[PDB]
Design a protein around this motif. Structure first.
Motif, PDB file in Angstrom:
ATOM      1  N   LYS A 231      26.292  28.683   8.291  1.00  0.00           N
ATOM      2  CA  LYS A 231      25.637  27.396   8.820  1.00  0.00           C
ATOM      3  C   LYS A 231      25.416  26.455   7.763  1.00  0.00           C
ATOM      4  CE  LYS A 231      23.360  29.994  12.616  1.00  0.00           C
ATOM      5  NZ  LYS A 231      22.495  30.004  13.843  1.00  0.00           N
ATOM      6  N   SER A 232      25.139  26.786   6.729  1.00  0.00           N
ATOM      7  CA  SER A 232      24.680  25.927   5.293  1.00  0.00           C
ATOM      8  C   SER A 232      26.017  25.243   4.959  1.00  0.00           C
ATOM      9  CB  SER A 232      24.001  26.701   4.252  1.00  0.00           C
ATOM     10  OG  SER A 232      22.807  26.991   4.927  1.00  0.00           O
ATOM     11  N   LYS A 233      27.004  25.934   4.843  1.00  0.00           N
ATOM     12  CA  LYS A 233      28.371  25.344   4.460  1.00  0.00           C
ATOM     13  C   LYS A 233      28.633  24.187   5.453  1.00  0.00           C
ATOM     14  CE  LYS A 233      29.892  28.990   1.889  1.00  0.00           C
ATOM     15  NZ  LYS A 233      30.883  30.326   1.685  1.00  0.00           N
ATOM     16  N   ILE A 234      28.611  24.309   6.743  1.00  0.00           N
ATOM     17  CA  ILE A 234      28.686  23.329   7.687  1.00  0.00           C
ATOM     18  C   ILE A 234      27.739  22.276   7.713  1.00  0.00           C
ATOM     19  CG2 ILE A 234      28.726  22.687  10.156  1.00  0.00           C
ATOM     20  CD1 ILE A 234      29.752  25.642  10.721  1.00  0.00           C
ATOM     21  N   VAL A 235      26.548  22.644   7.289  1.00  0.00           N
ATOM     22  CA  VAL A 235      25.507  21.492   7.214  1.00  0.00           C
ATOM     23  C   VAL A 235      26.037  20.487   6.056  1.00  0.00           C
ATOM     24  CG1 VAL A 235      23.291  20.990   6.384  1.00  0.00           C
ATOM     25  CG2 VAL A 235      23.572  22.337   8.422  1.00  0.00           C
ATOM     26  N   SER A 236      26.586  21.322   4.836  1.00  0.00           N
ATOM     27  CA  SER A 236      26.856  20.323   3.786  1.00  0.00           C
ATOM     28  C   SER A 236      28.115  19.415   4.229  1.00  0.00           C
ATOM     29  CB  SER A 236      27.228  21.244   2.647  1.00  0.00           C
ATOM     30  OG  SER A 236      28.771  21.733   2.997  1.00  0.00           O
ATOM     31  N   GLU A 237      28.757  19.534   5.243  1.00  0.00           N
ATOM     32  CA  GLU A 237      29.786  18.634   5.677  1.00  0.00           C
ATOM     33  C   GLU A 237      29.206  17.444   6.654  1.00  0.00           C
ATOM     34  OE1 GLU A 237      33.233  18.633   4.754  1.00  0.00           O
ATOM     35  OE2 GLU A 237      33.388  20.950   4.187  1.00  0.00           O
ATOM     36  N   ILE A 238      27.916  17.642   7.000  1.00  0.00           N
ATOM     37  CA  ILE A 238      27.376  16.695   7.944  1.00  0.00           C
ATOM     38  C   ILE A 238      26.614  15.802   7.202  1.00  0.00           C
ATOM     39  CG2 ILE A 238      26.263  16.172  10.122  1.00  0.00           C
ATOM     40  CD1 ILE A 238      28.665  17.691  10.641  1.00  0.00           C
ATOM     41  N   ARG A 239      25.842  16.348   6.190  1.00  0.00           N
ATOM     42  CA  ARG A 239      24.861  15.267   5.519  1.00  0.00           C
ATOM     43  C   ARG A 239      25.460  14.367   4.970  1.00  0.00           C
ATOM     44  NH1 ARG A 239      21.680  17.110   0.297  1.00  0.00           N
ATOM     45  NH2 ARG A 239      21.720  14.856   0.186  1.00  0.00           N
ATOM     46  N   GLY A 240      24.762  13.170   4.971  1.00  0.00           N
ATOM     47  CA  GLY A 240      25.189  12.041   4.488  1.00  0.00           C
ATOM     48  C   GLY A 240      26.324  11.145   5.680  1.00  0.00           C
ATOM     49  N   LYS A 241      26.485  11.747   6.704  1.00  0.00           N
ATOM     50  CA  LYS A 241      27.367  11.411   7.686  1.00  0.00           C
ATOM     51  C   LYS A 241      26.624  11.360   9.255  1.00  0.00           C
ATOM     52  CE  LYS A 241      31.361  13.477   5.112  1.00  0.00           C
ATOM     53  NZ  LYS A 241      32.723  13.951   5.053  1.00  0.00           N
ATOM     54  N   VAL A 242      25.433  11.440   9.244  1.00  0.00           N
ATOM     55  CA  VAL A 242      24.626  11.708  10.569  1.00  0.00           C
ATOM     56  C   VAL A 242      25.077  10.554  11.471  1.00  0.00           C
ATOM     57  CG1 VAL A 242      22.576  12.214  11.708  1.00  0.00           C
ATOM     58  CG2 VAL A 242      23.311  13.453   9.782  1.00  0.00           C
ATOM     59  N   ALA A 244      27.391   8.159  11.383  1.00  0.00           N
ATOM     60  CA  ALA A 244      28.792   7.919  11.761  1.00  0.00           C
ATOM     61  C   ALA A 244      29.058   9.173  12.821  1.00  0.00           C
ATOM     62  CB  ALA A 244      29.595   7.931  10.358  1.00  0.00           C
ATOM     63  N   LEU A 245      29.118  10.290  12.286  1.00  0.00           N
ATOM     64  CA  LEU A 245      29.386  11.430  13.082  1.00  0.00           C
ATOM     65  C   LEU A 245      28.755  11.601  14.512  1.00  0.00           C
ATOM     66  CD1 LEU A 245      30.162  14.242  10.308  1.00  0.00           C
ATOM     67  CD2 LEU A 245      31.537  12.488  11.346  1.00  0.00           C
ATOM     68  N   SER A 246      27.467  11.154  14.454  1.00  0.00           N
ATOM     69  CA  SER A 246      26.751  11.267  15.999  1.00  0.00           C
ATOM     70  C   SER A 246      27.336  10.303  16.959  1.00  0.00           C
ATOM     71  CB  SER A 246      25.241  10.980  15.781  1.00  0.00           C
ATOM     72  OG  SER A 246      25.218   9.546  15.291  1.00  0.00           O
ATOM     73  N   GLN A 247      28.098   9.443  16.494  1.00  0.00           N
ATOM     74  CA  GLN A 247      28.913   8.506  17.374  1.00  0.00           C
ATOM     75  C   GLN A 247      30.414   8.808  17.889  1.00  0.00           C
ATOM     76  OE1 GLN A 247      27.796   3.925  16.395  1.00  0.00           O
ATOM     77  NE2 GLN A 247      27.331   5.280  14.536  1.00  0.00           N
ATOM     78  N   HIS A 248      31.012   9.931  17.143  1.00  0.00           N
ATOM     79  CA  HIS A 248      32.124  10.567  17.382  1.00  0.00           C
ATOM     80  C   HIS A 248      32.118  11.457  18.616  1.00  0.00           C
ATOM     81  CE1 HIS A 248      35.813  12.709  16.451  1.00  0.00           C
ATOM     82  NE2 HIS A 248      36.159  11.772  15.823  1.00  0.00           N
ATOM     83  N   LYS A 249      33.136  11.134  19.278  1.00  0.00           N
ATOM     84  CA  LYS A 249      33.467  11.879  20.629  1.00  0.00           C
ATOM     85  C   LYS A 249      33.180  13.473  20.698  1.00  0.00           C
ATOM     86  CE  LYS A 249      36.373  11.918  24.688  1.00  0.00           C
ATOM     87  NZ  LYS A 249      35.452  13.133  25.538  1.00  0.00           N
ATOM     88  N   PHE A 250      33.742  13.870  19.295  1.00  0.00           N
ATOM     89  CA  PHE A 250      33.742  15.382  19.339  1.00  0.00           C
ATOM     90  C   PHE A 250      32.773  15.672  18.050  1.00  0.00           C
ATOM     91  CE2 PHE A 250      36.659  15.537  22.362  1.00  0.00           C
ATOM     92  CZ  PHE A 250      37.794  14.890  21.744  1.00  0.00           C
ATOM     93  N   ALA A 251      32.676  14.983  17.051  1.00  0.00           N
ATOM     94  CA  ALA A 251      31.484  15.558  15.987  1.00  0.00           C
ATOM     95  C   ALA A 251      30.320  15.250  16.529  1.00  0.00           C
ATOM     96  CB  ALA A 251      32.041  14.850  14.597  1.00  0.00           C
ATOM     97  N   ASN A 253      28.896  16.660  18.885  1.00  0.00           N
ATOM     98  CA  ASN A 253      28.723  18.121  19.140  1.00  0.00           C
ATOM     99  C   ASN A 253      28.100  18.865  18.106  1.00  0.00           C
ATOM    100  OD1 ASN A 253      29.533  17.212  21.841  1.00  0.00           O
ATOM    101  ND2 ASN A 253      31.764  18.368  21.370  1.00  0.00           N
ATOM    102  N   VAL A 254      28.827  18.666  17.022  1.00  0.00           N
ATOM    103  CA  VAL A 254      28.478  19.551  15.899  1.00  0.00           C
ATOM    104  C   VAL A 254      27.194  18.987  15.327  1.00  0.00           C
ATOM    105  CG1 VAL A 254      29.214  20.109  13.497  1.00  0.00           C
ATOM    106  CG2 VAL A 254      30.964  20.203  15.303  1.00  0.00           C
ATOM    107  N   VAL A 255      26.870  17.800  15.099  1.00  0.00           N
ATOM    108  CA  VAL A 255      25.677  17.142  14.722  1.00  0.00           C
ATOM    109  C   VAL A 255      24.566  17.522  15.453  1.00  0.00           C
ATOM    110  CG1 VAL A 255      24.231  15.219  14.110  1.00  0.00           C
ATOM    111  CG2 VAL A 255      26.828  15.083  13.775  1.00  0.00           C
ATOM    112  N   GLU A 256      24.652  17.612  16.784  1.00  0.00           N
ATOM    113  CA  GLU A 256      23.536  18.272  17.800  1.00  0.00           C
ATOM    114  C   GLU A 256      23.299  19.610  17.332  1.00  0.00           C
ATOM    115  OE1 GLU A 256      24.240  20.149  21.185  1.00  0.00           O
ATOM    116  OE2 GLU A 256      22.368  20.904  20.460  1.00  0.00           O
ATOM    117  N   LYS A 257      24.463  20.358  17.321  1.00  0.00           N
ATOM    118  CA  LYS A 257      24.231  21.852  16.925  1.00  0.00           C
ATOM    119  C   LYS A 257      23.585  22.276  15.685  1.00  0.00           C
ATOM    120  CE  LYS A 257      25.496  23.790  20.717  1.00  0.00           C
ATOM    121  NZ  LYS A 257      25.931  22.430  21.471  1.00  0.00           N
ATOM    122  N   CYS A 258      23.638  21.247  14.740  1.00  0.00           N
ATOM    123  CA  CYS A 258      23.205  21.442  13.275  1.00  0.00           C
ATOM    124  C   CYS A 258      21.594  21.192  13.582  1.00  0.00           C
ATOM    125  CB  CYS A 258      23.611  20.104  12.348  1.00  0.00           C
ATOM    126  SG  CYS A 258      25.257  20.977  11.636  1.00  0.00           S
TER     127      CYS A 258
END
Length: 342
Positions: A231-242, A244-251, A253-258
């Motif tokens: 989970k922490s590895k995935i979080v590392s790919e989301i931080r700094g991008k919340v 932008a990614l929260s507005q992405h049709k697919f990503a 979902n990932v932000v929410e699950k983080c």
């Protein structure tokens, strides 16, 4: 060209029809939409003798029925209710044909039910026929369901070749609509030694997977079910991008699950990120709340926030009540504010 008995059955002549009445017509009934349902239902409480009477007739036609739109259900019911000698007979007819059956629209159902019903050794002997054909099966409209059932049902020592076949292919398969389901099953059922290489490869492609139509499903799975370190590895790919990614049709979902499933400090970090960010002449939260995808992220941030972080969010959300009412989805956050402010 139906027999008189099948026609009479279809016309509701015989409300007390029994398996014994079907002698001579069992294969015909099995291939009929209504006749098949009749046999399926009767097999549940049939005596072993009654089951044998039916089996005698269908055995000669067993492969035909395995690949028949309605007859396959009758074969499944023999795996479900049959004797060990009946299951033996069926496994015999299947031997050397597991690959074509797995690729067949109805035969794949039979292999799946067989895997649920037969001994560990019988399972191992079936699944080995897929050696050399694993990726073909995983991407196939029918075969993928067989591979999933193998992962759910079969001993790990007898599955290892499937895991090995995924090496170098995890990204391609995770972005495939059928492949992504097989990857999820592996993450659930396989041993730690088997999932380790799959996860290592997944983490090499997280940026791309989070944005992919099907790949985001795999990433969500690791957030909901995986080890903290993954989970922490995935979080590392989301931080700094919340934002932008929260507005992405697919990503999104990932932000929410983080926000929902990551560690306490990780959840707080991502929330903090959008609380302190301005999106030009508007708040980051302002931007997120009017967005069809990010609004749900904000909803979750409210739900997950510690009392202290929640105070801040609710405080920054409040001046945009009128903006919220413009959107069909503004309903949820509005209701949260109302509950929050007495």
């Amino acid at each position: 060209g139906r027999s008189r008995l099948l026609e009479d059955f279809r016309n509701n002549r015989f409300p007390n029809l029994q398996l014994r009445d079907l002698i001579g017509h069992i294969v015909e009934f099995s291939q009929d939409q209504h006749g098949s349902r009749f046999i399926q239902q009767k097999l549940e409480r049939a005596t072993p003798a009654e089951r044998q009477i039916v089996f005698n007739e269908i055995l000669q036609a067993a492969y035909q029925l395995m690949t028949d739109v309605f007859g396959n259900y009758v074969i499944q019911k023999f795996f479900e209710f049959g004797s060990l000698d009946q299951k033996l007979a069926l496994a015999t007819r299947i031997r050397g044909h597991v690959l074509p059956l797995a690729l067949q629209m109805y035969g794949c159902r039979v292999i799946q039910k067989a895997l649920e019903s037969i001994s560990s050794d019988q399972q191992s002997e079936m699944v080995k026929e897929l050696d050399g054909h694993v990726l073909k099966c995983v991407k196939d409209q029918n075969g993928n369901h067989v591979v999933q059932k193998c992962i759910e049902c079969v001993q790990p020592q007898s599955l290892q070749f499937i895991i090995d076949a995924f090496k170098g292919q995890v990204f391609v398969l995770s972005t495939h609509p059928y492949g992504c389901r097989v990857i999820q099953r592996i993450l659930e059922h396989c041993t730690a030694e088997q999932t380790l290489p799959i996860l290592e490869e997944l983490h090499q492609h997280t940026e791309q997977l989070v944005q992919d139509q099907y790949g985001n499903y795999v990433i969500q799975h690791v957030l909901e079910h995986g080890r903290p370190e993954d989970k922490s590895k995935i979080v590392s790919e989301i931080r700094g991008k919340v934002l932008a990614l929260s507005q992405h049709k697919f990503a999104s979902n990932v932000v929410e699950k983080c926000v929902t499933h990551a560690s306490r400090a990780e959840r707080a970090l991502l929330i903090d990120e959008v609380c302190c960010q301005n999106d030009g002449p508007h708040s980051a939260l302002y931007t997120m709340m009017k967005d069809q995808y990010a609004n749900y992220v904000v909803q979750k941030m409210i739900d997950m926030a510690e009392p202290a972080q929640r105070k801040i969010i609710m405080h920054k959300i409040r001046p945009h009540i009128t903006t919220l009412r413009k959107y069909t989805y503004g309903k949820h956050i509005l209701a949260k504010l109302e509950k929050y402010y007495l």
